[PDB]
Every structure is written in structure tokens, then in C-alpha cells.
């Protein structure tokens, strides 16, 4: 129904969709689609390190790179079945849990281009929807806004909030998602500079998965 | 160079432009353009009332309506020269000071469609520009975003941040500003329902003024 970019105060809705396309929600979707038991978003590197135990992998990034002592970084390509099947993923990224903590909703799901059609189908029967973009370092995230616009366009609703309308209009101006993000996203440029251009291509590849991660008691999981 | 909508933490930049089109910055521009000595942003109604004294007018809104005890509301049409010329305007709006507090910049100006061209001309020689949209009650503000996009398109810089690129593309999709806002801005629709339709038309009128309000040590003035 509406889109918010990096909210500052608690946002209320019935159905919330978390978007951190350049990797975070793409990592969440990829990990769960490849067998991970669950993905637990955590705020700091320190607390992430305190959660080490058998069957658990400490993952994430800061400055887009894997922190010292961690198992995996925040590149979705690292989350292969042979590496994370049956494991619980403790994930801490730059946006920590900033977005999640401000969401006051009955349901919270994770979206990326990777599972876009599944997300759209799930949302068609939902009311009071808020697409919550995490943003980049508290700034506007082009890739998050683009995914939000793609979703809005396909929900075909008529009660669009300012954010949803702006996102849809922006989406309509895009000729090619991949090219658009590589050329105009600041975070995408940072990722490319660090050798992660492959991540941008993977993260913008639509529908490689048909899953819809749900946040249940602080853990993103797959459920019926 | 970039656009931010209702920032949460302090944003640092060399040059900042505050945007609260539906009234706040339109009121600030209108007031100074009509003779006001300055416009002082104030946080609470309690504080605004205390500053009452000869030569000062207490103005602002809460729920878009003029608070009890106040001289003027937040309708730019109220700031006529015959009423405010030479007086200091104490202005408190819903989240006015909260937004200004997030701007870590030595150079802060206010913009509206009312002084669009003057603002663009002012920014021509400016580097590291951040257009700060106030937003409405924590939500995205279409009218602020549209003005930001209009400014970005006029500057034609070779370095746009994510927000500026999105705002520019959005601006390019709009054929008519007044109709776009009346049809798609939740806040504009609320204002219309409260009887402020004239404000929507006035605030989206381009270049009625050629002034550029500057926040100088807590007070918006015309250098």
C-alpha cells in the first residue's frame, strides 16, 4: 500500500515487507532456499560473535566485507546448500536490525528480486501493506526503491500512499534493472569496486527462488 | 547532489536545502518575501507561546490547524505584507525542528516551488548538495520529492546520489505538478479536506518569489 525508506519511528501495518536488495534480504532468501534452518538478524558484530555454537554460522558484513572471526560474508553466492544446509544463520549487516525493530505488524516477510513473483503472489491477498526499504547507511537505496516499485506495479491497487506512487513511477522509468542499478546505485558501485559485481547480477536475477521468508520470533524461516 | 526523505540520523553536507513544500518551507519563503524580519523555527507550542512580545507573531500548526493562542496558522496565504512586514515570525510545525536538527551543514536554505528558480540559481556554484525532504508524520512526502526532483533536473550535475536519481526520474514522469499532488499526495488530500485547497495551488505555483531563505544561527533570513 505504501513505501517507506529507512523509517525513523515505529511504522504500523498489517503486512510488512523488508527490503535490503543489495545482499541482506537477497542473502536471507538465498540461504533459506538452499536449506538453512533460519536466519537471525543481529545488530552488532560483537553480539553476533557471542552466538557461536554447533550448527550455527556467524555471517554478515561491515564495509561490505566479512568481519574477522566470521564464517561467511554477505555475498549470496556464499550460501550454497553444501555450505549452509541445516544450519542456523546469525546475520549482522550494516543496517543491523534497524528496519525490523521499527516494524509493528502481524506479519513480516523478506523480499528481493530473487523471489519477486512469489512475494507478489503472497501479497495479492493481503491488506494494509507497507514495503520497508532498509536504505544504505541511512541514505536512499536505489535498488531497494526499484524492487518496491516493481512490487507496487504488480499489486495493481488503487490506494497508493505517496511512497508507493513515487516508487511505481520510478520503476516505470527503468529500461533494465541490472544496468540501472550498476550505473546509478552508490552501494552497487561500492560492491563492484570490491569485486562483487557478480553479486549485483545474481541479486537482480528475478525468480531464481519461489520462497517467501517470514520473520517469526526474530528468525526468518520458511513456513506454510 | 543527493536527496534524503525524513533522515533519521544527522546528515553531513556542504550545502543543504530544506524542503517541506506543503506549507512549512512555502510559509517561510512567503513570509520573508513579504517583509518578515526573520522566521525562527521552534519545537513546541509551549516554547512558541513564551516568545510572545511586541513585534513578534506566534505561528504554526498541529494537525494542520492554528494552535490556540497563535496569531497565524501554517497557510502561506496568511502571511501578507500588511500583516507581517517588519515582524519576527516564530514558527512551530509538527516536525519542523526535528528535521532541521538532522542537518549537519554550515549552509542551509529553504525551498518551495514558489522560489524554485532562485534556489537553482543559488545552488549553481555549490558543491556537495543535499536536498532534505521533511516528509509527513514519518511517511514519504510526494510533494517534497517532486520539488527535489525538479531541482535536481535543473542542476544537471554529473554526480547524483541514489535519492537524486530517483527523484529526477520521478519528476520526469509528472506532466502537471498541481494535479499530480492533488491526486497522489496523502497530505495534500488531508489539507484539501480541511479547506486548504487554495494552499495546494499557491504552494505549487512556480517562481512567485525570487528569494532564498537562509538559516543563520537558528533564524531564517534573507542575506
UniProtKB/Swiss-Prot annotation, chain A:
Which transformation does this protein catalyse, written as a reaction? (2R)-O-phospho-3-sulfolactate + H2O = (2R)-3-sulfolactate + phosphate
For this protein, the record's InterPro entries field holds: ComB-like, ComB-like_sf
Under Enzyme Commission nomenclature, its number is: 3.1.3.71
Q: Which cofactor does it need?
A: Mg(2+)
Q: Which UniProt keywords apply?
A: Hydrolase, Magnesium
Please provide an example of a Pfam family that matches this protein in its UniProt record.
Answer: 2-ph_phosp
The family database entries (Gene3D superfamilies) matched by this protein are listed as: ComB-like (3.90.1560.10)
GO terms of molecular function = 2-phosphosulfolactate phosphatase activity; magnesium ion binding; sulfopyruvate decarboxylase activity
The entry's family comment says: Belongs to the ComB family.
HAMAP family in the record, alphabetically? ComB
- What name does the UniProt record give this protein? Probable 2-phosphosulfolactate phosphatase
Query: In which organism is this protein found?
Result: Thermotoga maritima (strain ATCC 43589 / DSM 3109 / JCM 10099 / NBRC 100826 / MSB8)
The gene it comes from is comB
